[PDB]
Design a protein around this ligand. Structure first.
Ligand code: HEM
Ligand code: NA
Ligand code: NA
Length: 275
């Protein structure tokens, strides 16, 4: 009865209702990125290459250190997933993320769907393909991880801007204060430490805050700091801090690129919902 494209649209409606009710925009963006971020451009075969294939839905991968707390996001999406047999987790994760950015006031991401789902937890990538926030050499570590995905310096800086959304919890990743004046009252579950004052608003404030460092309640990870310390990253970081339009353009394109990493589409070229 309902076409697969129609189901994705219905799922998007459900997601928008979920975001309006739970204020869970940030975790949805993190979920999508952690499914896609395991992509390795050097591996040819699907699903060994990792990436956007819905493997992140399995306990084995959710248990990876970098994925602490993501089971909450999966659980929030499960009820929606159950309504649509024609919607894959691979697509649902990316749909929830893109919708989250947009509902949060971000740019419209040029998205395509039709991603195929892996079927067994044995197809999940091994742990260690996602970045650490506190390595000995942050900037080089970012290159090691993102260059492997086939992403460049521009994309590394632009995508890091997603930290304008959400916060860190010492009970999850281990970073951040237990709470601050900006998070102690929610909305959603209070607590943790945000990078920006309005952590439910998608704008270029992340770049301004990590550079200014005037607010002790605002978080700055070694990898965020690397954006302004690195001779190449700083070019884009300063540009985004001063040009919100430039950030939105580069962000939309980078987010779309990330969302496709390692995926196998059906049909091969995928399909659009509003093209
Ligand atoms: C540059 C490599 C990155 C590192 C080292 C990193 C690290 C972190 C850490 C430590 C947290 C705290 C999580 C917690 O407390 O539960 C976090 C949260 C988050 N990150 Fe990243 N991140 C990176 C890249 C990205 C990218 C590329 C995006 C998406 C375009 C992103 C989106 C988010 C979001 C939305 C949250 C907040 C989730 C929430 O509030 O529950 N991150 N990240
Ligand atoms: Na995956
Ligand atoms: Na923000």
């Amino acid at each position: 009865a309902a076409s697969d494209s129609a189901q994705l649209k219905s799922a998007r409606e459900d997601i928008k209702e979920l975001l309006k009710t739970k204020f869970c925009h940030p975790i949805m963006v993190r979920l999508g990125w952690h499914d896609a971020g395991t992509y390795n451009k050097n591996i040819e075969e699907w699903p060994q290459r990792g990436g956007a294939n819905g493997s992140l839905r399995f306990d084995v991968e959710l248990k990876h250190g970098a994925n602490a707390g993501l089971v909450n996001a999966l659980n929030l999406l499960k009820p929606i997933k159950d309504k649509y047999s024609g919607v894959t987790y691979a697509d649902l994760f990316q749909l929830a993320s893109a919708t989250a950015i947009e509902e949060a006031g971000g740019p419209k991401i040029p998205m395509k769907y039709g991603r195929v789902d892996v079927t067994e937890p044995e197809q999940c990538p091994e742990e260690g393909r996602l970045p650490d926030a506190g390595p000995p050499s942050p900037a080089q570590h970012l290159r090691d991880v993102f260059y492997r995905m086939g992403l460049n310096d521009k994309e590394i800086v632009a995508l890091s801007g997603a930290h304008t959304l959400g916060r860190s919890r010492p009970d999850r990743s281990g970073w951040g204060k237990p709470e601050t004046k900006y998070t102690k009252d929610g909305p959603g579950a209070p607590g943790g430490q945000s990078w920006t004052a309005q952590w439910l608003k998608f704008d270029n404030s992340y770049f301004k805050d990590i550079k200014e460092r005037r607010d002790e309640d605002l978080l700055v990870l070694p990898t965020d700091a690397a954006l302004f310390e690195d001779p190449s990253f700083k070019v884009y970081a300063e540009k985004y801090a001063a040009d919100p339009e430039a950030f939105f353009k580069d962000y939309a394109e980078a987010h779309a690129k990330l969302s496709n990493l390692g995926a196998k589409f059906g049909p091969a070229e995928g399909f659009s919902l509003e093209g």
